[PDB]
């Protein structure tokens, strides 16, 4: 087996905390090696470990320009491509003044094409949020963290099994996840994009406000009560009304009434 030999994976810095670190894969020892992102588990708890082998095989199998590339393994460590610009949540709040609604639409369209591919592979990400979207360059974004990703059963369109503010009502109430629960998450991502990930009006900061002053009432209970009423995240300030309408559709109470990614794609592209 031709792997990323541990002795050749030269550590540089941390990308996130298991954990992710930036390494230079230098098999020739002449410091001419390529920079790769390397994922590993730190406090290796037996259940998180089986989840890691599932994750590796999923990413290995996915081939979208909008999903992070799998590179290989080291030994367990998952080797992937390195996207230097970092997290989309950081990128939006740092360069907010230089990014217009047309550029946010380019990101929405790229995440959408990414998620559409995911669906055709009968995979459910489950953690679709701006915190797990990476930046290639100011004109290209890629989806990351397949840590929570689940493959749909060969006979079923749903799957019963923490990020509750991106979770659909069926996810909240009965732990049901499908491509349509990722459409609900996509609607929250559009909110994040169009608020430029402002800490002030984050989906987390906004729902807590809506939940009220009764903290002993379980979040899962208070959030579901709110989403059953029809209460939603507000229209982002200055957000194109055509976009906030697509957000509302992603937020339909029943999963069958939410648009598909295949349907959303042109609607985004044609604005
Ligand atoms: C501790 N402190 C360290 C410094 C800060 N971090 C960064 O400045 C950063 C710089 C480059 C980054 N590029 C990455 C990260 C990756 N996974 C990790 C990741 C996934 C999704 C979102 C964020 C991170 C992958 C991959 N192929 O999956 C590829 N490229 C990611 C962050 C904040 C956290």
Swiss-Prot record:
Tell me the tissue specificity.
In NK cells and an NK-like cell line but not in resting T-cells or in other tissues. The S-form is more commonly seen in hematopoietic lines, whereas the B-form is detected in cells both of hematopoietic and epithelial origins.
Q: Which residues carry this modification: Phosphotyrosine?
A: 82, 117, 158-159
- The Protein kinase domain extends over 9-271
Coiled-coil residues: none
Binding site residues for ATP? 15-20, 39
Q: How is it modified after translation?
A: Tyrosine phosphorylated in response to IL-2 and IL-4. Dephosphorylation of Tyr-158 and Tyr-159 by PTPN2 negatively regulates cytokine-mediated signaling.
> What disease has this protein been linked to?
Severe combined immunodeficiency autosomal recessive T-cell-negative/B-cell-positive/NK-cell-negative: A form of severe combined immunodeficiency (SCID), a genetically and clinically heterogeneous group of rare congenital disorders characterized by impairment of both humoral and cell-mediated immunity, leukopenia, and low or absent antibody levels. Patients present in infancy recurrent, persistent infections by opportunistic organisms. The common characteristic of all types of SCID is absence of T-cell-mediated cellular immunity due to a defect in T-cell development.
Oligomeric and partner information: Interacts with STAM2 and MYO18A. Interacts with SHB. Interacts with CD69.
Name of the featured protein:
Tyrosine-protein kinase JAK3
Origin organism of this chain? Homo sapiens
Which gene is transcribed and translated to give this protein?
JAK3
